[PDB]
């Protein structure tokens, strides 16, 4: 699977490592949420990441299915 990642500069799409067949999006507010919106982490995973309180995590299983909001139709 190819997933979007926020770990690169510029943000980019990457082929996920072996055994990581999901893309994920994890989002939470920081103190600038009211202006910059939520912080978003995008990447690859074997199992859909666990979420702490006030975090949102959603996974998907098709190529490039987890775009950053500013790179999403």
């Amino acid at each position, epitope marked *: 699977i190819v997933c979007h990642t*926020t*770990a690169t*500069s*510029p*943000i980019s799409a990457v082929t996920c490592p072996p055994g990581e067949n999901l893309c994920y999006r*994890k*989002m939470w507010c920081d103190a*600038f949420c009211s*202006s*910059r*919106g*939520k*912080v*978003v*982490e*995008l*990447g690859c995973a074997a199992t859909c990441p666990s979420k702490k309180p006030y975090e949102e995590v959603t996974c998907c299983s098709t190529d490039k299915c987890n775009p*950053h*909001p*500013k*790179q999403r139709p």
Partner: antibody
Amino acid sequence: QVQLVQSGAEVKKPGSSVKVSCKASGGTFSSYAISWVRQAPGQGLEWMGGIIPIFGTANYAQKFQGRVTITADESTSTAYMELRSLRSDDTAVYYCARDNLGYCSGGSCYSDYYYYYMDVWGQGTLVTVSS
Amino acid sequence: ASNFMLTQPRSVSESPGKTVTISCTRSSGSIGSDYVHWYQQRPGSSPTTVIYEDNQRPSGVPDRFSGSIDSSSNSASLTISGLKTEDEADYYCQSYDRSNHEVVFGGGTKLTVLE
């Protein structure tokens, strides 16, 4: 203590274009946005737009949409403002300026554009357009 | 389609050692819905920040400079106490219009120190 260093003053004929550059010290734009702000003679500051290289996206003020192009090359740590179809109202000092609040850290990034305060400013570039 | 306006007085004048206040009134929408920052610009120089995020002072900026917000007048204010001749400069407020996704600058205030 990043600095932004801009190209020099230019004098231009009407209808021509100018491309002003803005070189960041330190070899990178990181996750920062760079805006272009201009100041016509004796007048106030006016935002033209900005660019966020880490997202590959630019934002424009409606007043300049389609006539200005703002770009940046991370590999040469240089940002640019190309303003086309120059007219007398474009005589101004043009500044580049860094948004103090980066868009990314620790492998995650903010979701929305929001231009915060401008901490580091270039020295300005005068562009004078004849009548 | 028009951005909101930030309106400042064109000129403010005062003697050294006095306190001066420069206001920045938002024409539409609430002043508290978006941060206000303030820049100083001396002649022939680039702007520098004196107040950001309504009332925060960058390192290096003297404590004589402060910022505040007044919801009832829908305004932000830059206050300079113990005015010094070196404070003569143009001052600009700045905020952001979320509807149009644009930075908004006030029109600028020229501060003159009376002799």
